[PDB]
A paper describes a structure:
Binding of an extracellular agonist leads to conformational changes in the receptor, triggering activation of associated signalling partners on the intracellular side of the membrane. Previously, we determined the structure of NTSR1 bound to NTS8–13 (Arg-Arg-Pro-Tyr-Ile-Leu) in an active-like conformation with six thermostabilizing mutations providing insight into the binding mode of a peptide agonist.
In addition, we determined the structure of NTSR1-LF (with L310 and F358) to 2.6 Å resolution. This latter mutant has moderate ability to activate G protein likely because of the absence of the E1663.49 side chain. The comparison with NTSR1-ELF is thus expected to provide insight into the structural role of E1663.49, a residue critical for governing receptor conformation and G-protein recognition. The R8 side chain in NTSR1-LF (but not in NTSR1-ELF) is also connected to TM7 through water-mediated hydrogen bonds to D3457.29. Of the intracellular loops, ICL1 showed electron density for the main chain atoms in NTSR1-LF but not in NTSR1-ELF. In G-protein-coupling assays, NTSR1-LF had moderate ability to activate the G protein. In contrast, NTSR1-LF showed monophasic curves indicating a single class of binding sites. The structures of NTSR1-LF and NTSR1-ELF, presented here, are very similar (root mean squared deviation values of 0.3 Å for Cα atoms, excluding T4 lysozyme), yet their ability to activate the G protein in response to NTS differs: NTSR1-LF mediates moderate nucleotide exchange at Gαq, whereas NTSR1-ELF has almost wild-type receptor properties. Thus the mutation E166A3.49 alone may explain the pharmacological behaviour of NTSR1-LF, highlighting the importance of E1663.49 for G-protein activation.
Author numbering:
A (entry chain A): 49 to 268, 297 to 383, 1002 to 1165
B (entry chain B): 8 to 13
């Protein structure tokens, strides 16, 4: 019992080590992962401007994560886990530490959020996407968010401070880095920090990633197995964010909102144990992010190891690289792309050359086929969403049946499918069997009966029963 | 006696 006997934190030797070992494991895994990532994204050098934007945002994320681990952890391990008093890094050490910590933190939260926006635009607004962001415009946006991170961390230079809390006036063992302004200001700072680096991005992420996942689910067996993992990764990313960051913000808020008359030896002891738990998870974020945001990638799988409607239509329309005549006698190419209704084969050919911008002679590549396909599906969903008679029906449907509606619009057009007035109300009211019986009575069903029945079957079951042929 | 480590 001396003048700094009160500053003593009582965490058992067991815990302190178990936590050190954990921390040091995260430190190797995380610093490697984020570095390897930086190395691996540098040499990729993609051609597409949409996929390279993502590579930039991902690079930014990996740096801000690396920097958390390198700047926040060493000092935490010495001064907040093992040796709580005295603070051994001076007044400017105290101010600089919380500045940097919060900056990297802000930079990660904003990164993760901006990335989610980027992906929302790429997929849901592809027209604007290409016209709204290219290599130089994102490079500048990444800069905007490191400056913004830097600005939002400035308050921590003015609110943290070195201070002697010894019983005695001032013994050198009683110096501690801690907030040193009116609880009123500390309470407001803290809550801003909590809103601007947890709540705000929480919504952005949690909403946009759910909208992407759902949309990407409908857009989409070996051929597409990676895109289905991507969907799972997207839902995982939110889960990872909440679990790893919420308890860290809970703990900061408890630090300031529990008043002096309420602090006991019990809560005080419980805090510093909780501190161990919340900060382990906090850092885990930085260690997992590289391996989570990049596991579904192509080479990357190897790399660290070296240290609905697409499917349905690909069955129903097939893939041909040379010009053919469809069911009805019209020249078509690729995956169901109708070129023209004119009986002239030169008219088709002319129209094809026009479609891609190259003197094909009536033959195309697999990549060209898929380029046209993505455009025609874009076209079919816009048709549905702007149509008074199809949008309500589409909205009411699960992901599998939505695709089956897109199948019909792909084959027949917006205004074609719109004529199925009674079958569409049945679908909208979940009368799956009635709809199916009624769809089977149509001209569409006589013209192309296998395809029709597969779609019909999909409508009545919501299963993949009809598409065993899919790869 | 409250915590000083934020």
């Amino acid at each position: 019992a001396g003048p700094n006997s009160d500053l003593d934190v009582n965490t058992d030797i067991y815990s302190k080590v178990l936590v050190t070992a954990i921390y040091l494991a995260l430190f190797v895994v995380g610093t490697v992962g984020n570095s390897v990532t930086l190395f691996t994204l540098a040499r990729k050098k993609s051609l597409q401007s949409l996929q390279s934007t993502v590579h930039y945002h991902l690079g930014s994320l990996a740096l801000s994560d690396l920097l958390i681990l390198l700047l926040a952890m060493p000092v935490e391990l010495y001064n907040f886990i093992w040796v709580h008093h005295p603070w051994a890094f001076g007044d400017a050490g105290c101010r600089g530490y919380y500045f940097l910590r919060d900056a990297c933190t802000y930079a990660t939260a904003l990164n993760v959020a901006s990335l989610s926006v980027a992906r929302y635009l790429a997929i849901c607004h592809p027209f604007k996407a290409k016209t709204l962001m290219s290599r130089s415009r994102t490079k500048k946006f990444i800069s905007a968010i490191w400056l913004a991170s830097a600005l939002l961390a400035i308050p921590m230079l003015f609110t943290m401070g070195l201070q002697n809390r010894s019983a005695d006036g001032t013994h050198p063992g009683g110096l501690v880095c801690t907030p040193i302004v009116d609880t009123a200001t500390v309470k407001v700072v803290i809550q801003v920090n909590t809103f601007m680096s947890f709540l705000f991005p929480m919504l952005v992420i949690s909403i946009l990633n759910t909208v992407i996942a759902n949309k990407l689910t409908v857009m989409v067996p070996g051929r597409v197995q990676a895109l289905r993992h991507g969907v799972l990764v997207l839902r995982a990313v939110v889960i990872a964010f909440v679990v790893c960051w919420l308890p860290y913000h809970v703990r900061r808020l408890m630090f300031c909102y529990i008043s002096d008359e309420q602090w006991t030896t019990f809560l005080f002891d419980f805090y510093h144990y909780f501190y161990m738990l919340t900060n382990a998870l906090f850092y885990a974020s930085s260690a997992i992010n590289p391996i989570l945001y990049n596991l579904v990638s192509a080479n990357f799988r190897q790399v660290f190891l070296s240290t609905n409607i697409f499917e349905m239509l690909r069955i129903d329309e097939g893939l041909r690289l040379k010009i053919y005549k469809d069911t009805e006698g019209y020249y078509t190419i690729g995956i169901g792309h109708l070129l023209t209704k004119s009986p002239s084969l030169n008219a088709a050919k002319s129209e094809l050359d026009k479609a891609i911008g190259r003197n094909t002679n009536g033959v195309i590549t697999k990549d060209e086929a898929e380029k046209l396909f993505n455009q025609d599906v874009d076209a079919a969903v816009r048709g549905i969403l702007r149509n008074a008679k199809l949008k309500p029906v589409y909205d009411s449907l699960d992901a599998v049946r939505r695709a089956a509606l897109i199948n019909m619009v792909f084959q027949m057009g917006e205004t074609g499918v719109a004529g199925f007035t009674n079958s569409l109300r049945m679908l909208n009211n979940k009368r799956w069997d009635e709809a199916a019986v009624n769809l089977a009575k149509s001209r569409w069903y006589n013209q192309t009966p296998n395809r029709a029945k597969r779609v019909i079957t999909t409508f009545r079951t919501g299963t993949w029963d009809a598409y065993g042929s899919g790869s | 006696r409250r915590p000083y480590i934020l």
